[PDB]
Design a protein around this nucleic acid. Structure first.
Ligand SMILES: [Mg+2]
Ligand SMILES: [Zn+2]
Ligand SMILES: [Zn+2]
Lengths: 99, 99, 1362, 50, 79, 277
DNA sequence: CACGTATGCTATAATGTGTGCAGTCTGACGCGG
DNA sequence: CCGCGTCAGACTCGTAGGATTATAGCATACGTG
RNA sequence: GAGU
């Protein structure tokens, strides 16, 4: 962890039941800031109808979305992503449906 | 984590659990008794029916909420139906004698 | 859709066929390639319906264009796929099979009905032996088992005319042919011959079975299955996982076994196979069916490759994982979220911080609806995409919707109702929920990582329920005790303490200030301290006789701090309330006072205000914790050195072989306990009042201005016990067993413990921590049982119109009025006035709620005891009236009809246990009891008044007590009771009865460690049944020759000395017995186990000499782990191990005969002249001495009272008060306030049922047990119609059995014991009309209580008028 | 940098945190003295003595 | 009204029936678009109903009266 | 007493006397003739053989009792097809039938999803081949390595190995902890969403409103032909026959009504375009 | 006819199982000898 | 009585997916495009 | 593993 300058005193109930009041300075210096490496997988399986494809050719996709995806349909190294962004494009053979 | 409406469980029909599966919280027996103590009848019934199994009730309630009218249209939880069927599979005749 | 009731009855083979829509003849689930259901298989779509909505299998018929069409090609009906979960199938079994539930689940049912032992049935079933179904030749009777060779003998001899068969067929046939009517009459005729006690029970059981069997319309044939039902596909799903894998229910595997075995049996029959193979297959079939229904019941559960037993049908209904508990009494719920919680000091009481992101999701549909009214969103899909993009206009809309909309915050475990409270959400940027400080108490929420759940009340009704019933502002008071639960804590208390507390002169002593505004100005200018003593002009509003307020200006003497707090104080309240130094305990009273005078709204505002100023001043103070505050006492080393030498003295006495190991262990504990107290006292005195260094005039003194002491004295945090371990002494640690270690921890925390002190600490610490994790389950289980049994109790009526009620007296345990008559009776309805001419002329009329007003008048008048209307004594059937309950403690006024009181009661009783099981479980590592029960020192002057005492004057001239129920009172001038104390057996008194005593005078003195056995007569000691090795042992020493006689118990005794009772017989010089004064009782005192004897046989004694000393190891730990099992033993109505004996009926006591010491009693009343006899064990000594006028339920023996016997002899008020007091003893010892009325609720539920002894005009008759409500309603109709009246007697039931005894089998089954409950109900043909709350919640209906009471009574009037 | 509530000490009986804080402050005090001396650049000798 | 419901409870009495009464009134405003007595002052339907009850305008029995009055006039119109 | 199925059955078989060769031949001559008693005695005398063989084949297929019954069925086939005249012993002949029947039973019943014999036996040769490969490669073999050995398609090998994927129970609790099973996580994918159900209401109802905007004639033609407000999707001839003879005119009014809806959409389609996700 | 699924037969003698784990918990409440 | 059996044993949260084996070889038989 |  990280050592720091602490004072023991109440403060307007912001440290009520063990609660902690911390200075913006600690956040600015990013010393408690942490790194997390998460792992997302796209599987292309073979179904009864036929194989799933990992193409960039997907129904209903914006150019904005496909910009960060290469020809294969895979996001580029270095790319910043946010919830909802497509990482690996994949498509599945859909059967009949009574419209 | 938070959820309004999402996937539901297979046989019991009540919402699934856990944040990774986009689940609802459990309102357990303990939690039910709280509401009973207070006497909050509709809130209770709400959590038993429109918020959980009651299939036609949940959809009807959702439509009503989007149309403003906060009307309760409650029915019977599907898990109860299941229970009867499980008892009949046991070879015990358990019938509802209606009014 | 909506039904009235639910019936369970036996499933006929024919009935099973009715539900079925196809016979499943194949194990094939689906095809390997086209994963479509296989023909006549377990998932057959021809049987159970179409896989896809309005599509046949082969795809010939598609859409609604073909509605009810049945495809000729494939054979599938074209409908909703929905039906696959609804439609059942069936299997035709070649050989009949027993239903395991109606076989193995006891009572046997099938065995009970045939009166055939279970083993016997089984030998028949598994084809070990034949059974005779009808031996026409009376030579061979019915149901008589024959072995294989036994069947061969009578085969040639009788043959033909006797039919005896083997297996399920035989038993089914035997069942079919039994005529229940006839045999019922036959058995009833035999019941009249000589009905022995146990015989009459078993016979009455079969009688009730046969009666109920005919009433149900069930037939015994149906116990045997020929048709086996098949559960719908979707309730045993076969689904493909994403990865191409398949996952199925275990039921499908079990069914595949059954089908395979049954179909092989059909094959073996077609092939006409030899009978041994037919037998094996029939057993095989039964095995598979039994596994299907209930796997690990009969024998080895059939296991998967994982080793784990397959989950059968019954496992899905049974236990926690079962449908009831898991998916029906509790559910996963939409519009719910959860997060980490943190403080919101800035929040007002009715608010909470709700993360924007969370609220955006929770209120999704309301946002869409509003978006369409604004015309911002064209369609629902567009609104969805608009909220995904999280547009700035959507934030404003969300803000619009959340206004005035309550959300529910919940924290687990939800012990009482306040664990869920409603708030107005305040949207905040950031992911944690912010909780208001004052309600932290109710949630038990501390922010060390706690999390909370959020729920959205959706409907206008639910929103209103939340705002009105569940809002934090509205629910202040604990429903358990009438105390405000929202009480400032921690920093808030600390700050208020800091402002109100006074210091010597300080800045600006004796200033004169205009109003508290001038005070605030001066303080913040820095010309006065908060603790400066000062004169201040305050205008205090005193509320008049009516609502009008009268104000009055006064110059008071207070600090600057107190004046400033007066600004937060509302007008109406007095200044003297704040004029004292404030702490947590005073602030709770403050809030209460404000609630009672002003009301809700003022108190709510005042509470917030107090919170703000509390924290505010807390911070300013600059209060901190450094190593120097932990002041040590110079007399620390000194005290310890002395204590060690004192312990060493007893250790040297032990090596000498004089003092025992137990005696030394006790004395060492007492030395260290006394030293620990003195060191604590020295630390507190050296820290409490150390501020001698004053000023102003000259050297004055004041209270210590420490940071620690202040924290503890204010009640913010810490206590004297804690500071002992910081500065003083750690104390005596306790082992995980409960016993205390001989060496305590002498050191403390500031000084630092060594390796061994630390190690020694660990044991006790860990024991405590484990107790948190492990014992809370048992606490919580208690909560659950209570709740289940009180469920049904609701306020049904306003006034029952009863005159009945319990007479509450005063309690004075030790000295302080633990439960003054005022605190015990407040907010109860007075059943009956008490006219004592008096000082304030008080009648207080009937049916008056005791307001604080009338209670204060009672104190002035000195009321002794009062009849108060009670839940138990209510006449309302199917609930209680508002009057018999009284105040809803959580509201502070009379309870509203409709309120579900039972649930409240059980929660309130259960919670503390459950919470205290976690608390003193980690807040302390150490044990602190008090073995100071040495003597009794009176506090105030008065005259001594002994009641129920029986002592005898000794040689030393001391009134030695020989009574067990001895008690000492302290009567004042007017003849009023005040102080009392339990004086034990063999205690030495100071002064006789009545004698006067001054203050601080020792009137009693005894030795706790040891229960001496003092005599009554003088003479010589004679040994009877005191053989060495048989009952006693021999223990001597060296030189002269001393020896100690110890009494072994059956535990350490021999088969020979088992019936031998050791005693010390008293004789004179001539060798003749000495009778007890004024009786024909030879003085013979029976020694119990482990009894020690110093002086051996042949020794002269005088009246008052101790014969023996019974050692007494009570490790009383204690805390709660010990208490709650006592409480549970009470609520479950378990009879104590050695119960006292009571007189049954009033009359004159007559002693009779003795069987080798076993006492018979030939008792003869006055009116009922016929004698009544009762056998008593030999060693059990009676406290009374015969020949007496005895009321019903006078205590003969020493021992604990069984609640059953109390009810049976002294009626309901007696047992009710016994349980209430005995329970309250536990909780009182742990400092838990619970109102008696809650325990009274439970008691009443326990007294639901009554056994009828003598026939009525109905079909009650002898020995049936029915609900007391129903039989009293019957008696109202009997009164009207005359006819034969029904004589009954009320019975007490433990909580578990009382819940199982309710007429509702859904409630019973859902509770526990589900397999048995269901067999019972199915056979009885029982119907539940759904009265209780449990029942309704299971079916997802509207509760019959609270909000729902209105709707439910409307439905009920619809039911009554057709 | 952080303000902790002192009311979470006496109940808890974890005094290690307080000792840690005092020693911590002394540790940092010496650090600041060394830091001050390094900024001034007194000399190797003087740093070594201290 | 808004925070604390105490004076509203004092008017009606039974908390539970207060909830029913206010819900029925709020449903009228929500669905029927029935006219509020007290100025909304930008408050929600639920709050409007509770204010009305506090001041003693709405009552279970009064609601029943206006229900029959208007229903009877509707039947008169039909005939 | 002694309530094990197995023990009881084994005791019963024990109490039948073992046959010699000459006895078997005499009995069996009469058994083929149809002696009944002879057949019964030969079966019962040779049950012990069945149990010895089922003991071997058990292991992991099925319950011992299950194997014993199937084995008995094989033994019965053997008694029906025995040749007494041929010098070969009965036990030798029966062993073949008993092993055969047990194996065939365990090829069918063992698998939850019933696998045809051909597929099963194919799969088994893939397995045995894999074993030889693994011994010599040191490594367990890939799908394509097994395929190269058989000189066959990799798709064939892959499909077979997919079928060998053995089942997981939905009820099996997850994570070595008796907390919650697969069922507790597993969604119903088909069942949308009060969202989705309410969206269909909204959709269907918006279409009603849109249909009424059009002419009475167009709306009725559309309703009857689509099967929207009508019951059945009435063909051109049906709609024309009920209204206006001209079958061609139904097509004309229908297509006209669609184009008027396009106009409403270009004007007020601002709501309709958002139905595209 | 072919393709997918099934039913079938094979002849030295061999003729009563075991096998893989369970680990022992606890205070209470009934049920045949 | 003794002994053997059955029944209960807090509430929410979490993490992560996953295991095993083997059934011969060939000729005729039944159902679908 | 997180509060009880
Ligand atoms: Mg906590
Ligand atoms: Zn079809
Ligand atoms: Zn009453």
């Amino acid at each position: 962890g990280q050592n720091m300058r602490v004072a023991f005193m109440p403060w307007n109930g912001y440290n009520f039941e063990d609660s902690i009041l911390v200075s913006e300075r600690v956040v600015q210096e990013d010393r408690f800031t942490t790194i997390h490496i998460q792992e997302l997988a796209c599987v292309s399986r073979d179904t009864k109808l036929g194989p799933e494809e990992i193409t960039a050719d997907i129904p209903n996709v914006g150019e904005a979305a496909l910009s960060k995806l290469d020809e294969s349909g895979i996001v580029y190294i270095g790319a910043e992503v946010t919830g909802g962004d497509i990482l690996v494009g994949k498509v599945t053979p859909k059967g009949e449906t009574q419209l | 984590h938070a959820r309004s409406t999402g996937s539901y469980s297979l046989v019991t029909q009540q919402p699934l659990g856990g944040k990774a599966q986009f689940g609802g919280q459990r309102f357990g027996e303990m939690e039910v008794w709280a509401l009973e103590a207070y006497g909050a009848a509709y809130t209770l019934q709400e959590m038993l029916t429109v918020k959980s199994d009651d299939v036609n009730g949940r959809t009807k309630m959702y439509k009503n909420i989007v149309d403003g009218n906060h009307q309760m249209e409650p029915g019977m939880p599907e898990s109860f139906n299941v229970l009867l069927k499980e008892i009949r599979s046991l070879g015990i005749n358990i019938e509802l004698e209606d009014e | 859709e909506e039904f009235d009731a639910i019936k369970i009855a036996l499933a006929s083979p024919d009935m099973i066929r009715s539900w079925s829509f196809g016979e499943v003849k194949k194990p094939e689930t689906i095809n390997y390639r086209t994963f479509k259901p296989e023909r006549d298989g377990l998932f057959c779509a021809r049987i159970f319906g179409p896989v896809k909505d309005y599509e046949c299998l082969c795809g010939k018929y598609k859409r609604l264009k073909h509605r009810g069409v049945i495809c000729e090609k494939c054979g599938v009906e074209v409908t909703q796929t929905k039906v696959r979960r609804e439609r059942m199938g069936h299997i035709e079994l070649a050989s009949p099979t027993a239903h395991i539930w109606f076989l193995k689940s006891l009572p046997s049912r099938i065995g009970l009905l045939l009166d055939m032992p279970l083993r016997d049935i089984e030998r028949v079933l598994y084809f070990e032996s034949y059974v005779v179904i009808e031996g026409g030749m009376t030579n061979l009777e019915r149901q008589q088992i024959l072995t294989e060779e036994q069947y061969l003998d009578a085969l040639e001899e009788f043959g033909d005319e006797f039919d005896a068969k083997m297996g399920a067929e035989a038993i089914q046939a035997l069942l079919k042919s039994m005529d229940l009517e006839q045999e019922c009459e036959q058995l009833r005729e035999e019941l009249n011959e000589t009905n022995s006690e146990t015989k009459r029970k078993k016979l009455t059981k079969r009688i009730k079975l046969l009666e109920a069997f005919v009433q149900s319309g069930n037939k015994p044939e149906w116990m045997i299955l020929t048709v086996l039902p098949v559960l719908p596909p979707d309730l045993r799903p076969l689904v493909p996982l994403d990865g191409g894998r398949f996952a199925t229910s275990d039921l499908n595997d079990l069914y595949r076994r059954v089908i395979n075995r049954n179909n092989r049996l059909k094959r073996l029959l077609d092939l006409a196979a030899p009978d041994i193979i037919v037998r094996n297959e029939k057993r095989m079939l039964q095995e598979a069916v039994d596994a299907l229904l209930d796997n690990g019941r009969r024998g080895r559960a059939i296991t998967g490759s994982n080793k784990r037993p397959l989950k059968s049908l019954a496992d899905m209904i049974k236990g926690k994982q079962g449908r009831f508990r898991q998916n029906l009494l509790g559910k996963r719920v939409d519009y719910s979220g959860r997060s980490v919680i943190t403080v919101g000091p800035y929040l007002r009481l009715h608010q909470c911080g709700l993360p924007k992101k969370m609220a955006l999701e929770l209120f999704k549909p309301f946002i869409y609806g509003k978006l369409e009214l604004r015309g911002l969103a064209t369609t629902i899909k567009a609104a969805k995409k608009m909220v995904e993009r999280e547009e700035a206009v959507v934030w404003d809309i969300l803000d619009e919707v959340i206004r005035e909309h309550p959300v529910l915050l919940n924290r687990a475990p939800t012990l009482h109702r306040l664990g869920i409270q409603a708030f107005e959400p305040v949207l905040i940027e950031g992911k944690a929920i912010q909780l208001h400080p004052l309600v932290c108490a109710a949630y038990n929420a501390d922010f060390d990582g706690d999390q909370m759940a959020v729920h959205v009340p959706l409907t206008l009704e639910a929103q209103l329920e939340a705002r009105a019933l569940m809002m934090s502002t509205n629910n202040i008071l604990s429903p358990a005790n009438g105390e405000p639960i929202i009480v400032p804590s921690q920093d808030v208390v600390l700050g208020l303490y800091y402002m109100t507390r006074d210091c010597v002169n300080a800045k600006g002593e004796g200033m004169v200030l205009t109003g508290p505004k001038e005070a605030e100005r001066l303080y913040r200018s820095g010309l006065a301290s908060l603790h400066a003593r000062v004169k201040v002009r305050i205008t205090e509003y005193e509320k008049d006789a009516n609502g009008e307020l009268v104000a009055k200006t006064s110059l008071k003497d207070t600090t600057v701090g107190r004046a400033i707090l007066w600004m937060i104080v509302p007008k109406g309240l007095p200044y003297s309330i704040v004029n004292q130094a404030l702490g947590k305990k005073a602030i709770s009273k403050m809030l209460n006072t404000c609630y009672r005078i002003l009301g809700l709204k003022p108190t709510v505002i005042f509470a917030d205000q107090i919170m703000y100023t509390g924290f505010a001043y807390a911070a300013r103070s600059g209060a901190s914790v450094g190593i120097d505050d932990m002041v040590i006492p110079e007399k620390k080393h000194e005290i310890i050195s002395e204590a060690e030498a004192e312990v060493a003295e007893i250790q040297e006495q032990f090596q000498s072989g004089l003092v025992t190991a137990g005696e030394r262990y006790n004395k060492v504990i007492d030395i260290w306990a006394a030293a620990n107290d003195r060191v604590s006292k020295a630390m507190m005195d050296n820290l409490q009042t150390e501020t001698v260094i004053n000023r102003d005039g000259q050297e004055e003194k004041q209270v210590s201005f420490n940071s620690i002491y202040m924290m503890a004295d204010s009640g913010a945090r810490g206590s004297a016990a804690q500071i002992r371990q910081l500065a003083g002494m750690r104390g005596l640690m306790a082992k995980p067993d409960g016993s205390i270690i001989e060496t305590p921890i002498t050191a403390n925390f500031r000084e630092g413990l060594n390796v061994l002190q630390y190690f020694i600490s660990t044991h006790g610490a860990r024991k405590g921590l484990a107790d948190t994790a492990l014992k809370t389950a048992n606490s919580g289980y208690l909560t659950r049982r209570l709740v289940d049994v009180a469920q049904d109790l609701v306020v049904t009526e306003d006034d029952c119109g009863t005159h009945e009620g319990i007479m509450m007296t005063p309690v004075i345990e030790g000295g302080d009025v633990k439960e003054p008559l005022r605190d015990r009776v407040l907010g109860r309805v007075t059943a009956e006035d008490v006219l004592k001419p008096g000082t304030a002329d008080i009648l207080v009329p009937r049916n008056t709620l005791l307001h604080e007003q009338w209670c204060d008048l009672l104190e002035e008048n000195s009321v002794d005891a009062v009849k108060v209307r009670s839940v138990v004594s209510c006449d309302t059937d199917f609930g209680v009236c508002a009057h018999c309950y009284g105040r809803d403690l959580a509201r502070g006024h009379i309870i509203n009809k409709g309120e579900a009181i039972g649930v409240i009661a059980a929660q309130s009783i259960g919670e503390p246990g459950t919470q205290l099981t976690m608390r003193t479980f980690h807040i302390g590592g150490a044990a602190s009891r008090a073995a100071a029960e040495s003597s009794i020192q009176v506090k105030n002057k008065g005259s001594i008044k002994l009641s129920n005492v029986k002592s005898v004057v000794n040689s030393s001239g001391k009134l030695v007590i020989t009574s067990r129920n001895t008690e000492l009172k302290l009567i004042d001038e007017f003849g009023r009771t005040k102080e009392s104390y339990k004086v034990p057996y063999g205690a030495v008194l100071a002064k006789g009865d009545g004698e006067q005593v001054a203050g601080g005078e020792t009137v009693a003195n005894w030795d706790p460690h040891t229960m001496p056995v003092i005599t009554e007569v003088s003479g010589f000691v004679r040994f009877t049944d005191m053989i060495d090795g048989q009952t006693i042992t021999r223990q001597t020493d060296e030189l002269t020759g001393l020896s100690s006689l110890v009494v072994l118990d059956s535990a350490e005794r021999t088969a020979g000395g088992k019936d031998l009772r050791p005693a010390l017989k008293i004789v004179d010089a001539q060798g003749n017995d000495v009778l007890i004064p004024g009786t024909d009782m030879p003085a013979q005192y029976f020694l119990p186990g482990k009894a020690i004897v110093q002086l051996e046989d042949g020794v002269q004694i005088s009246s008052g000499d101790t014969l023996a000393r019974i050692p007494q190891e009570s490790g009383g730990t204690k805390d709660i782990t010990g208490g709650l099992p006592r409480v549970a033993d009470l609520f479950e109505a378990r009879r104590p191990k050695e119960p006292a004996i009571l007189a049954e009926i009033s009359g004159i006591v007559s002693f009779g005969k003795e069987t080798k010491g076993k006492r018979r009693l030939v008792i003869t009343p006055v009116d009922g002249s016929d004698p009544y006899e009762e056998m008593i064990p030999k060693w059990r000594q009676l406290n009374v001495f015969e020949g007496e006028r005895v009321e019903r339920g006078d205590v003969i023996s020493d021992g604990p009272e069984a609640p059953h016997d109390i009810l049976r002899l002294r009626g309901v008020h007696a047992v009710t008060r016994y349980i209430v007091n005995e329970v309250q003893d536990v909780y009182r010892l742990q400092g838990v306030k619970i109102n008696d009325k809650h325990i009274e609720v439970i008691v009443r539920q326990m007294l639901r049922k009554a056994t009828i002894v003598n026939a009525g005009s109905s079909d009650f008759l002898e020995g049936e047990q029915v609900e007391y409500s129903r039989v009293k309603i019957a008696n109202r109709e009997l009164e009207a119609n005359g006819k034969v009246g029904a004589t009954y007697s009320r019975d007490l039931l433990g909580i578990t059995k009382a819940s199982l005894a309710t007429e509702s089998f859904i409630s019973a089954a859902s509770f526990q014991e589900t397999t048995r409950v269901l067999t019972e109900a199915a056979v009885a043909g029982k119907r539940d009309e759904l009265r209780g709350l449990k029942e309704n919640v299971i079916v997802g209906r509207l509760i019959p209580a609270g909000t729902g009471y209105a709707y439910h009574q409307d439905r009920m009037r619809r039911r009554a008028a057709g | 940098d952080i303000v902790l509530n002192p009311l979470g000490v006496p109940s808890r009986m974890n005094i290690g945190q307080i000792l840690e804080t005092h020693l911590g402050m002394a540790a940092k005090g010496i650090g600041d003295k060394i830091n001050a001396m390094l900024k001034q650049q007194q000399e190797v000798a003087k740093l070594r003595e201290f | 009204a808004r925070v604390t419901v105490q004076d509203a409870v004092e008017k009606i009495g039974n908390r539970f029936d207060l909830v029913l009464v206010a819900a029925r009134r709020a449903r009228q405003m929500q669905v029927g678009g029935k006219d509020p007595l007290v100025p909304e002052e930008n408050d929600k339907t639920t709050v409007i109903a509770l204010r009305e009850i506090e001041e003693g305008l709405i009552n279970n029995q009064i609601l029943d009266v206006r229900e029959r009055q208007e229903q009877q006039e509707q039947e008169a119109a039909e005939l | 007493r002694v309530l094990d199925a197995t023990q009881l059955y084994l005791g019963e078989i024990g109490y039948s006397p073992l046959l010699t060769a000459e006895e078997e031949v005499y009995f069996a001559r009469r058994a083929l003739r149809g002696d009944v008693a002879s057949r019964r005695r030969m079966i019962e005398s040779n049950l012990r053989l069945v149990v010895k063989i089922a003991r071997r084949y058990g292991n992991r297929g099925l319950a011992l009792l299950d194997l014993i019954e199937e084995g008995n069925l094989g033994l019965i086939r053997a008694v029906e097809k025995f040749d007494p005249e041929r010098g070969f012993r009965f036990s030798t002949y029966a062993t073949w039938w008993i092993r055969q029947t047990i194996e065939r039973a365990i090829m069918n019943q063992t698998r939850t999803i019933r696998l045809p014999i051909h597929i099963v036996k194919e799969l088994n040769v893939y397995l045995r081949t894999a074993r030889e490969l693994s011994h010599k490669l040191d490594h367990e073999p890939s799908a394509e390595e097994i395929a190269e050995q058989l000189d066959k398609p990799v798709d064939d090998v892959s499909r077979m190995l997919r079928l060998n994927e053995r089942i997981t129970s939905v009820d099996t609790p997850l994570g070595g902890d008796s907390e919650k099973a697969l069922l507790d996580i597993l969604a119903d994918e088909k069942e949308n969403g009060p969202e989705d159900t309410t969206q269909d209401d909204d959709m269907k109802q918006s279409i009603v409103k849109w249909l009424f905007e059009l002419n009475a004639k167009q709306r009725e033609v559309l309703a009857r032909r689509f099967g929207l407000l009508g019951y059945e999707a009435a063909t051109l001839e049906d709609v024309g026959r009920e209204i206006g003879l001209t079958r061609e005119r139904v097509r004309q009014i229908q297509v006209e009504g669609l184009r008027r809806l396009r106009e409403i959409l270009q004007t007020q389609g601002l709501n309709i375009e958002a139905l595209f996700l």
